[PDB]
Amino acid sequence: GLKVPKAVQKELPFKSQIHVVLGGDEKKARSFIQKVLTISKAKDSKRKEQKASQRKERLKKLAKMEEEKSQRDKEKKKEYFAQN
Protein backbone atom coordinates (compact mmCIF):
# COMPACT_ATOMS: atom_id res chain seq x y z
CA GLY A 1 0.00 0.00 0.00
CA LEU A 2 0.81 3.68 -0.40
CA LYS A 3 2.68 4.53 2.80
CA VAL A 4 3.34 8.14 3.82
CA PRO A 5 5.61 9.52 6.55
CA LYS A 6 3.98 11.06 9.58
CA ALA A 7 6.13 14.19 9.30
CA VAL A 8 4.60 14.94 5.89
CA GLN A 9 1.07 13.67 6.60
CA LYS A 10 0.79 15.73 9.81
CA GLU A 11 1.71 18.82 7.80
CA LEU A 12 -0.33 19.31 4.63
CA PRO A 13 -2.86 21.80 3.21
CA PHE A 14 -6.47 21.12 4.10
CA LYS A 15 -7.96 20.32 0.72
CA SER A 16 -5.11 18.07 -0.43
CA GLN A 17 -5.29 15.99 2.74
CA ILE A 18 -5.62 12.22 2.74
CA HIS A 19 -8.70 12.12 4.95
CA VAL A 20 -29.43 -6.82 13.71
CA VAL A 21 -28.74 -9.67 11.31
CA LEU A 22 -30.47 -13.05 11.04
CA GLY A 23 -28.73 -16.40 11.27
CA GLY A 24 -29.94 -18.73 8.56
CA ASP A 25 -31.72 -18.48 5.23
CA GLU A 26 -31.43 -14.67 5.18
CA LYS A 27 -27.63 -14.57 5.42
CA LYS A 28 -27.15 -17.57 3.14
CA ALA A 29 -29.34 -15.84 0.54
CA ARG A 30 -27.33 -12.65 1.00
CA SER A 31 -24.12 -14.58 0.39
CA PHE A 32 -25.87 -16.13 -2.62
CA ILE A 33 -26.49 -12.65 -4.03
CA GLN A 34 -22.87 -11.77 -3.20
CA LYS A 35 -21.81 -14.84 -5.18
CA VAL A 36 -23.81 -13.89 -8.26
CA LEU A 37 -22.60 -10.30 -7.96
CA THR A 38 -18.91 -11.21 -7.95
CA ILE A 39 -19.62 -13.68 -10.76
CA SER A 40 -21.14 -10.89 -12.86
CA LYS A 41 -18.32 -8.51 -11.96
CA ALA A 42 -15.47 -10.82 -12.92
CA LYS A 43 -17.33 -11.84 -16.08
CA ASP A 44 -17.90 -8.39 -17.51
CA SER A 45 -14.43 -7.25 -16.43
CA LYS A 46 -13.13 -10.11 -18.58
CA ARG A 47 -15.46 -8.90 -21.34
CA LYS A 48 -14.28 -5.28 -21.17
CA GLU A 49 -10.58 -6.14 -21.13
CA GLN A 50 -11.18 -8.47 -24.08
CA LYS A 51 -12.76 -5.57 -25.97
CA ALA A 52 -9.84 -3.28 -25.09
CA SER A 53 -7.29 -5.84 -26.24
CA GLN A 54 -9.33 -6.16 -29.43
CA ARG A 55 -9.22 -2.44 -30.16
CA LYS A 56 -5.46 -2.61 -29.56
CA GLU A 57 -5.03 -4.59 -32.78
CA ARG A 58 -7.77 -2.51 -34.43
CA LEU A 59 -5.72 0.63 -33.72
CA LYS A 60 -2.46 -0.90 -34.93
CA LYS A 61 -3.90 -2.25 -38.20
CA LEU A 62 -5.77 0.98 -38.92
CA ALA A 63 -2.65 3.01 -38.10
CA LYS A 64 -0.33 1.22 -40.49
CA MET A 65 -2.88 1.18 -43.31
CA GLU A 66 -3.60 4.91 -42.95
CA GLU A 67 0.17 5.46 -42.90
CA GLU A 68 0.63 3.77 -46.26
CA LYS A 69 -2.48 5.40 -47.75
CA SER A 70 -1.29 8.83 -46.60
CA GLN A 71 2.12 8.27 -48.19
CA ARG A 72 0.43 7.15 -51.42
CA ASP A 73 -1.72 10.30 -51.43
CA LYS A 74 1.33 12.45 -50.70
CA GLU A 75 3.19 10.95 -53.65
CA LYS A 76 0.04 11.48 -55.75
CA LYS A 77 -0.03 15.19 -54.97
CA LYS A 78 3.78 15.19 -55.31
CA GLU A 79 3.60 14.01 -58.91
CA TYR A 80 0.61 16.31 -59.54
CA PHE A 81 2.70 19.30 -58.52
CA ALA A 82 5.65 17.78 -60.38
CA GLN A 83 3.80 17.72 -63.72
CA ASN A 84 3.56 21.54 -63.77
Binding site: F32, K35, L37, S40
Partner: protein
Protein backbone atom coordinates in the same frame (compact mmCIF):
# COMPACT_ATOMS: atom_id res chain seq x y z
CA UNK B 1 -40.91 2.52 -2.10
CA UNK B 2 -38.58 1.73 0.80
CA UNK B 3 -41.22 -0.27 2.65
CA UNK B 4 -41.33 -3.17 0.19
CA UNK B 5 -37.79 -2.45 -1.04
CA UNK B 6 -36.62 -4.84 1.68
CA UNK B 7 -38.57 -7.68 0.08
CA UNK B 8 -37.62 -6.81 -3.49
CA UNK B 9 -34.15 -5.35 -2.96
CA UNK B 10 -32.38 -8.52 -4.15
CA UNK B 11 -34.29 -9.56 -7.21
CA UNK B 12 -33.98 -6.33 -9.15
CA UNK B 13 -30.24 -6.49 -8.55
CA UNK B 14 -30.05 -10.00 -9.94
CA UNK B 15 -32.26 -8.99 -12.88
CA UNK B 16 -29.64 -6.30 -13.43
CA UNK B 17 -27.12 -9.14 -13.14
CA UNK B 18 -28.90 -11.56 -15.47
CA UNK B 19 -25.83 -11.66 -17.73
CA UNK B 20 -24.12 -14.36 -15.66
CA UNK B 21 -26.99 -16.06 -13.86
CA UNK B 22 -26.89 -19.04 -16.24
CA UNK B 23 -24.03 -19.77 -18.65
CA UNK B 24 -26.30 -20.43 -21.63
CA UNK B 25 -28.07 -17.14 -22.38
CA UNK B 26 -25.94 -13.99 -23.00
CA UNK B 27 -28.65 -11.35 -22.73
CA UNK B 28 -27.80 -8.31 -24.80
CA UNK B 29 -26.00 -5.40 -23.21
CA UNK B 30 -27.91 -2.73 -21.36
CA UNK B 31 -27.31 -1.21 -17.96
CA UNK B 32 -30.88 -1.24 -16.60
CA UNK B 33 -30.75 1.02 -13.62
CA UNK B 34 -33.67 0.31 -11.28
CA UNK B 35 -36.70 2.19 -12.64
CA UNK B 36 -38.80 4.55 -10.58
CA UNK B 37 -42.13 2.80 -11.23
CA UNK B 38 -42.51 -0.96 -11.39
CA UNK B 39 -44.56 -3.82 -10.00
CA UNK B 40 -43.94 -7.48 -9.31
CA UNK B 41 -46.42 -10.03 -10.59
CA UNK B 42 -46.79 -13.68 -11.42
CA UNK B 43 -47.82 -15.35 -14.66
CA UNK B 44 -51.09 -17.20 -14.69
CA UNK B 45 -51.41 -20.13 -17.03
CA UNK B 46 -53.68 -20.73 -19.99
CA UNK B 47 -56.32 -23.32 -19.18
CA UNK B 48 -55.53 -25.32 -22.31
CA UNK B 49 -51.84 -25.05 -21.42
CA UNK B 50 -51.28 -28.13 -19.30
CA UNK B 51 -48.51 -30.76 -19.04
CA UNK B 52 -46.24 -28.30 -20.89
CA UNK B 53 -45.14 -25.18 -18.97
CA UNK B 54 -47.43 -24.98 -15.92
CA UNK B 55 -45.56 -25.20 -12.62
CA UNK B 56 -47.18 -27.45 -10.03
CA UNK B 57 -48.84 -26.51 -6.75
CA UNK B 58 -46.08 -27.51 -4.33
CA UNK B 59 -43.53 -26.36 -6.93
CA UNK B 60 -44.69 -22.73 -6.90
CA UNK B 61 -42.01 -21.02 -4.83
CA UNK B 62 -43.59 -17.70 -3.90
CA UNK B 63 -40.52 -15.59 -4.78
CA UNK B 64 -38.19 -15.52 -7.78
CA UNK B 65 -35.27 -15.84 -5.35
CA UNK B 66 -36.80 -18.99 -3.89
CA UNK B 67 -37.50 -20.36 -7.37
CA UNK B 68 -33.86 -19.71 -8.25
CA UNK B 69 -32.84 -21.41 -5.00
CA UNK B 70 -34.85 -24.45 -6.15
CA UNK B 71 -32.65 -26.29 -8.67
CA UNK B 72 -29.39 -27.56 -7.19
CA UNK B 73 -27.78 -28.04 -10.62
CA UNK B 74 -27.89 -24.29 -11.19
CA UNK B 75 -26.66 -23.86 -7.62
CA UNK B 76 -23.97 -26.42 -8.42
CA UNK B 77 -22.81 -24.24 -11.30
CA UNK B 78 -22.81 -21.30 -8.88
CA UNK B 79 -20.79 -23.36 -6.41
CA UNK B 80 -18.13 -24.49 -8.87
CA UNK B 81 -17.67 -21.08 -10.45
CA UNK B 82 -17.57 -19.27 -7.11
CA UNK B 83 -15.07 -21.83 -5.82
CA UNK B 84 -12.75 -21.38 -8.79
CA UNK B 85 -13.15 -17.60 -8.45
CA UNK B 86 -12.29 -17.79 -4.73
CA UNK B 87 -9.21 -19.94 -5.25
CA UNK B 88 -8.02 -17.79 -8.15
CA UNK B 89 -8.58 -14.57 -6.19
CA UNK B 90 -6.90 -15.70 -2.96
Amino acid sequence: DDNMRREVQRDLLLIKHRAALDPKRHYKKQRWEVPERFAIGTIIEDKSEFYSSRMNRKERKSTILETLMGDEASNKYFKRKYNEIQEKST
